[PDB]
Design a protein around this ligand. Sequence first.
Ligand code: CO
Ligand code: CO
Ligand code: CO
Ligand code: CO
Ligand code: CO
Ligand code: CO
Ligand code: CO
Lengths: 157, 157
Amino acid sequence: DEFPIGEDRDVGPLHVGGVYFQPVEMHPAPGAQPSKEEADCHIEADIHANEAGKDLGYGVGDFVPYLRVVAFLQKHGSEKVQKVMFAPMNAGDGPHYGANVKFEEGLGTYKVRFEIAAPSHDEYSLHIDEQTGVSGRFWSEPLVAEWDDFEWKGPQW
Amino acid sequence: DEFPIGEDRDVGPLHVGGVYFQPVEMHPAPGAQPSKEEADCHIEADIHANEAGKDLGYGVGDFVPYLRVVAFLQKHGSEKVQKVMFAPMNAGDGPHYGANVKFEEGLGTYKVRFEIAAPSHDEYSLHIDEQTGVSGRFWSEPLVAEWDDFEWKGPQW
Ligand SMILES: [Co+2]
Ligand SMILES: [Co+2]
Ligand SMILES: [Co+2]
Ligand SMILES: [Co+2]
Ligand SMILES: [Co+2]
Ligand SMILES: [Co+2]
Ligand SMILES: [Co+2]
């Protein structure tokens, strides 16, 4: 089972969903994420183009690759913030941005914020000529999708 | 308007098409590719998952991101080979890999080869747990789509 972090958000050209479920094993194991055994769960950000995404050239529903996605978790009652760097990966059901996560502050209700940066100038381009190009341009400040009352009560699996 | 490089190829889990048309302006201008004015044409590699791609977790027909695509162009009867690193980008028709290029030995018949490497070790992962993961793996030797008799007969525009 997948469990929602909250209701899907539309922000700019992106439709953004968040879900969590059991920790997974990834190859290669990304960055500094906890192993399947060490982690509390896996959290994924599903990011697909919405209608406004067409101005950048995307088809509506297309996965949007080359983004840099980071999550920030803050337990209600705490001033501590945990930063989670998501990584691009495929599961059985396709390309996602995801991470194994261990909640440093434990059980409780959290504010969960996804900050989504556009592809680096070095890593992606847009056709901009009249004939073949697109009208839109990538966003400069990261797009934000946030849920304010995410309840972490331990594994639901 | 797009012109064909040759017949579409299926290689491993990828369906690969090659087209060319007038040089384009890109933002930012990628790597060391020629400008719109300096180039002879823009060449695109259109790469989507085929049925064998479903084992890697891709939706069949999905664009396959994070690949490293390099084109080699060699005029018939010549020992000179041009190496062109393609860049990921969007045009009005969506994400693809491509480049502005010059045909450096002028008009005539060229061998055109796309070598397609899987994502860098640190750029992508697969879920591999039995529960959420996939049973396929990335290819180790780059995949090759090639056309032995592409005719560069100059701008068709
Ligand atoms: Co939705
Ligand atoms: Co939407
Ligand atoms: Co999903
Ligand atoms: Co994942
Ligand atoms: Co820019
Ligand atoms: Co292009
Ligand atoms: Co590997």
